[PDB]
Amino acid sequence: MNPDDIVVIIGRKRSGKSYLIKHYFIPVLKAHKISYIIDDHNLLRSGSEYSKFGYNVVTLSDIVSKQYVVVYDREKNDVFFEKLWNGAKLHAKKWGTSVLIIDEAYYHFKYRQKVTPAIDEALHANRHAGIGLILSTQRVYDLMPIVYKQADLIIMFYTREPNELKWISKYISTEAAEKVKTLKQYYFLIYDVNSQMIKIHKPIH
Ligand SMILES: [Zn+2]
């Protein structure tokens, strides 16, 4: 197992996307002892919804000891992402290939005129860093078109919005836009960017 590819997952709240990430992707990585870092921006006072999947790294001991990491991003900042990314590259030096999971990728990967060096590395040199990416977002146009060009896999849950379908067809795949509107609840469509193939998946157990 060497997960250094880029997966984008698109789905609204309650689409079932959270279950796919938290009850499939993260547990599979843990099971195969693949390290990961989760970037979470959801300030709940009960704390991160990802707290059971990893540790908040604070001390020197944490730095060398904690393979599964949760980061609370209060900043949602380009300054923050450079630290997160530079940190992840070193995390992979320590633990081997690692996966950076971004819970609401809009904050870092939304449209910007001047794309920061780290974001550029994330999208164009991720396999050199040994960092796979899972970018989660609610709506397809939340993210720069370049993200979908650079992705290996694009996972989509049902959407009705005409704005979304036309965006999908324009920037990703017309066939995907056609089949996404046919998805039953919790079903998800997977577009493989490298094979140009679309598969519909049944809901996770
Ligand atoms: Zn963040």
Side-chain angles (χ1 to χ4, degrees), residues 1-48 50-71 73-159 161-204:
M1 182 162 295
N2 200 28
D4 62 357
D5 49 332
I6 296 175
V7 176
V8 185
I9 306 180
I10 311 164
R12 296 199 37 209
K13 317 239 175 62
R14 300 178 194 241
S15 63
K17 171 187 66 170
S18 73
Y19 195 89
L20 178 56
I21 298 176
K22 294 185 286 161
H23 295 257
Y24 185 63
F25 272 115
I26 285 166
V28 168
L29 296 176
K30 215 296 179 49
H32 289 265
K33 295 168 172 176
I34 300 300
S35 55
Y36 51 79
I37 304 159
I38 301 157
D39 183 27
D40 182 18
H41 314 81
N42 190 341
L43 222 36
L44 299 173
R45 296 180 294 109
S46 63
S48 177
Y50 291 96
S51 67
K52 306 250 215 91
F53 304 116
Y55 206 82
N56 196 240
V57 167
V58 170
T59 62
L60 295 171
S61 297
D62 290 340
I63 282 171
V64 74
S65 291
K66 301 301 176 176
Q67 195 178 347
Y68 312 103
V69 179
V70 180
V71 184
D73 184 13
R74 183 38 218 157
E75 303 310 322
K76 304 160 192 177
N77 199 328
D78 270 343
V79 189
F80 179 88
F81 184 83
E82 194 198 14
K83 280 193 286 195
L84 179 71
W85 176 252
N86 286 334
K89 286 193 288 193
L90 284 157
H91 200 250
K93 277 214 83 181
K94 171 74 183 64
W95 301 107
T97 298
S98 299
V99 178
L100 182 57
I101 306 177
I102 318 281
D103 175 77
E104 292 174 281
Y106 169 76
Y107 287 126
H108 302 306
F109 290 84
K110 67 180 172 175
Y111 186 78
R112 212 169 265 108
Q113 297 320 330
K114 303 159 259 184
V115 181
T116 60
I119 292 290
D120 172 73
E121 282 195 7
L123 293 181
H124 295 278
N126 80 291
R127 277 132 194 255
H128 196 268
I131 299 173
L133 300 178
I134 300 175
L135 309 180
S136 180
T137 194
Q138 281 208 83
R139 282 133 170 80
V140 57
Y141 49 67
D142 292 333
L143 309 186
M144 281 186 304
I146 181 60
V147 170
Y148 301 106
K149 166 167 163 298
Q150 291 302 107
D152 298 283
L153 211 74
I154 302 162
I155 304 185
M156 300 171 199
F157 289 79
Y158 173 76
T159 176
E161 184 167 46
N163 285 16
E164 274 203 271
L165 303 179
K166 259 159 135 49
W167 210 96
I168 292 174
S169 172
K170 176 172 181 173
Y171 290 103
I172 304 176
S173 159
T174 300
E175 188 192 346
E178 247 319 323
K179 290 173 179 176
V180 71
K181 61 174 74 175
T182 72
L183 293 171
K184 292 173 194 305
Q185 199 198 26
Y186 300 144
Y187 285 68
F188 50 102
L189 179 147
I190 301 194
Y191 176 69
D192 185 317
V193 177
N194 297 314
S195 75
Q196 303 187 335
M197 300 242 290
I198 291 158
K199 215 78 184 180
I200 296 188
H201 295 241
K202 301 195 154 188
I204 307 303

